[PDB]
Amino acid sequence: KGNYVVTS
């Protein structure tokens, strides 16, 4: 459920 990062 939104398990990722694009902007760190």
Epitope: G2, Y4, V6
Partner: antibody
Framework: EVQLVESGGGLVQPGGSLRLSCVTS????????MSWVRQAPGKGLEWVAS?????????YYSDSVKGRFTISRDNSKNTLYLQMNSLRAEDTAVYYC?????????????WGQGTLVTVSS | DIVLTQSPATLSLSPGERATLSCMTS??????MNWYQQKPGQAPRLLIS???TLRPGVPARFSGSGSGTDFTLTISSLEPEDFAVYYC?????????FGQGTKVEIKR
């Protein structure tokens, strides 16, 4: 306009290695997430890997390529890479460099023309 | 891994007709659905992004609707250049997953 230009594709024997490069223009590269998506001959689209912005410390891979492929970036060269090791026949496909459209999504807006990778003995 | 099921795999229509393309997901992905167009020999083009957001430059005849598990791409009136393959993509979770495509072809 935005341009993504892939290179480094070609013929390779099973078990071999290739490194794809994608040189970008038309936007501030360091500000965007980037992904590789591939398309096998006559087949649909399949996501391969994604990398965070700006440094690219955070990366994601499909199970099909986990442990074999490595995505990386060089912001000073506007370049995205895909290191492909231990290649197999089923890795044959056109490989697309793509840009994540937002600061929070890898959903692609711009795509390169793609580079063909053929794995065969 | 979230599965996207597109139907019908082939949509047979004539220019001028309304096209309805369906994408169903194996689980609730909120509104993180995206739609692409691909013509033979060409790279895909983004038509609609998360939240059924129409991309700048895309003709108004394209529109996305739905959320949760049932999504629809509508082409209000088909132009000759609209006959192509369309893919859906969920960007809710990794791995990012695509539908297997719907081909909009010429009926005769």
């Amino acid at each position: 306009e935005v341009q993504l230009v892939e290179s480094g594709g070609g013929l390779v024997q099973p078990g071999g290695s290739l490194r794809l490069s994608c040189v970008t223009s038309g936007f501030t590269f360091r500000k965007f997430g980037m992904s590789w998506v591939r398309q096998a001959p006559g087949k649909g689209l399949e996501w391969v890997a994604s990398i965070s912005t700006p440094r690219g410390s955070t990366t994601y891979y499909s199970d099909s390529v986990k442990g074999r492929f490595t995505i990386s970036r060089d912001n000073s060269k506007n370049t995205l890479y895909l290191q492909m090791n231990s290649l197999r026949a089923e890795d044959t496909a056109v490989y697309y460099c793509t840009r994540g459209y937002s600061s929070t999504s890898y959903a692609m807006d711009y795509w390169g023309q793609g580079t063909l990778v053929t794995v065969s003995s | 891994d979230i599965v996207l099921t597109q139907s019908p795999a082939t949509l047979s229509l004539s220019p001028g007709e309304r096209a309805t393309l369906s994408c169903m997901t194996s689980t609730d992905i909120d509104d993180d659905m995206n739609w692409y167009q691909q013509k033979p020999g060409q790279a895909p083009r983004l038509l609609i992004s998360e939240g059924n957001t129409l991309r700048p430059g895309v003709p108004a005849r394209f529109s996305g609707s739905g959320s949760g598990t049932d999504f629809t791409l509508t082409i209000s009136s088909l132009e000759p250049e609209d006959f192509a393959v369309y893919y859906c993509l969920q960007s809710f979770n990794v791995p990012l997953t695509f539908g297997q495509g719907t081909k909009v072809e010429i009926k005769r």
